[model samples]
Target: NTYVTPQAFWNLYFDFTGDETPGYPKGKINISQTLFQSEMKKNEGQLILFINSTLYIYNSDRQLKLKQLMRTAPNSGFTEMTAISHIGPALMYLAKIKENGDASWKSQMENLLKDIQAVKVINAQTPNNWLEQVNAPAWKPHLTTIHNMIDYACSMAGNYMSDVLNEKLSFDMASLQNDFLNGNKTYPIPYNNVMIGTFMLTALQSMDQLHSKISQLKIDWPHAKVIIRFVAGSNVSAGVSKGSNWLVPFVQALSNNKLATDRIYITPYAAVKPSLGAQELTQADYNYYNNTVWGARHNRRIIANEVFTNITSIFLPDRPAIPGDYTYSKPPKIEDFLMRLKFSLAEPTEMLSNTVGFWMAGELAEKNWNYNKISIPGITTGFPEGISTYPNNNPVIQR
Candidate 1:
């Protein structure tokens, strides 16, 4: 009962799985809201706020994690899309400075480390320091958690880093409110939705950890927002040698406005129905996608470009906008915007500007205008008026 003042704190949410990257969460931690508040309660009161994690992970030294993965397996498919990797540096920062012979710093940092111990993914005996956190056997009693951290990274960061609770109470700290408040139902939900009545589950088991770190910053640096500089080609991007399937969902989550656009510049690579080349698919266009640096790196680079940049056109063809295509001519309808979210996840692939509906209609117009304009390509001028053509402005204009 020490916190006397009230303040607002914001976080970027994207913590799900660190398994894809390998080094970030050698020992897992979900860091749920309950865990966050418990430590936060020590500070006083807080009404939480949040922005998305796209910006958080942009210059997050993601390349640091990428390299961590690259040197490890080097062949397993991987993705840098999860929030856990980005969350790592921030946490390490907190643990490092939570107690620097100061009052404001230590009180908050001390509580934050305790918070990390209690919730992640959102559970265990509170650890006083990161060292204590990593050492507590009961904290992350799993083969996988130990396998990477202790077993692999030699505690530098590894297969043994995480402590996945593997239960429903672990992730869903809000449901059965009384049970949680009473302190009996302190377990997390599973990653999947196998339900009896209704339920929610873990998102990569790192949401809790993510909050712990952000809360630390919001507390420590109350005046300024954290800035992670993103250099698209330099570091904020990488290729998945293995599980690329997870990458699409990660970007979709951000582009879908899950991440606020206050500062981020993500111009997702949307799936647009192509304009069946009025000419032909350039051989370079064909080769860039067809034959690249082999496989994983090639695919990963494409995704990173879409996820990091602000426009899809960094890679697409040079087609002019249709004269009457509303998707192109009009300001984006907020509704139409979300449906595509500047990111295309559809099978046929559509974009906000070149949506399927617009493309289809444009296709009709293209064919009608060009084909209907002059049907007989190689003919000695003749009369060939049809309904598809505008009522010949000239009584003599013919095909």
Candidate 2:
């Protein structure tokens, strides 16, 4: 079939998830590989190549299916090269066509309806036109398939809208708290028995939905790699929210859950609190990993960014690299990297870049980095040594 990179597909998938805001195209779909192949054949192989590529990215079993199909094809080279040609347009259609800030529920429904109507127009065209005459009938099922998907998306979006509105009017904090207080058995696991925070409660609620969606995905694509990484902010970074005692137990439940037979990597990544310098950052992150209650459990993998301030932000060194601190100066070991990736349910691949690790380590060099002076009284003295000393090196950092 097609061979689109997982990275590209993940990027598009994230875009579809509407993580930045909401209401692009909410919810999930569970399409079987067999049905997908059947639809591919029905469509006369128009989008089959693209869809097959998508399936492969999301599911390893589908990857095997694609390989089998390729092996049996009359002209494997021709089919593959032709499939490659469609990748550009397919990605553009999937990623670039968006409603922008129109993330409202109405906008989601409208966009989906417009897409369905466009396909409907194609479906309704008379065969008098040569193009329609030859292709319309073959494309009928494909159009229907699209309609089914759009309709499903519309339904899910409506539900999401309702959930959103309900949450706005009457936040479920009390209800959830009461459920926990009363030892309610509403969660798939014994969540009520576990001690957790308000933020953690919200996360747990989402996990209930996540479990259902993942279970369905497993049925639809059994060999799909599932790595559910839960990240927590540093005590300083996430000042309001306290740590969850339930995190490790919850992850253990997921790892031992019956829903997944294959390996399901469920790990917690806690942020390293910002510190005086890179050396301190490294030690802080290391100590955070080794000394924390979550880290004490050897069953799960834990990650702490040495110098990185936030989960999404670029790698920024808290302080200059210290030549004296050997651990901070050197890049992360290959063994450590591979082990982390393995724990995360990602296969170690030569293609994967180690640059990020090296760069983060490279930032450990100590220099006179000065914070800009803005005539703030006693606050200026509280600044680091380098900030005032290295006047030229004053860096104004903003979020």
TM-score of 1: 0.17
In model 2, where is the ten-residue run with the lowest total lDDT? Answer: 43-52
Error of 2 at 169 (Å): 28
**TM-score to native of every candidate shown:** 0.17, 0.17
- Which candidate number has the best lDDT? 2
* lDDT minimum window of 10 residues, candidate 1: 192-201
lDDT of 1: 0.24
lDDT of 1 by residue, 1-399 (tens): 886433322112214323234444445443432332243245211111111122221111111100011011211111111122222333334334533533343354344434333323121123442323332222232313212221111111111122112122221223222222111211111111011000000121222223233334333122111212112232223221101112222222223323332222122221111321213334333222122211223335556776878765555543344322323533222223223322332422232222222322322233332322321110111112321211111111011
Model 2, residue 259: C-alpha shift (Å): 16
Model 2: per-residue lDDT, tens digit, 1-399? 897667767657654243323533345332221322333244010000111111111221122222111111232122222222222222223223332432343454344434434433443345552222332221232333323322322232223223333453221334333332222222211121111111111222233333333334233322222332322222221111111122222323333333232233332243323431222224433333322322233222222344444766455443333221124323322223323223322322211112122222122112111112111111112122333310221111110
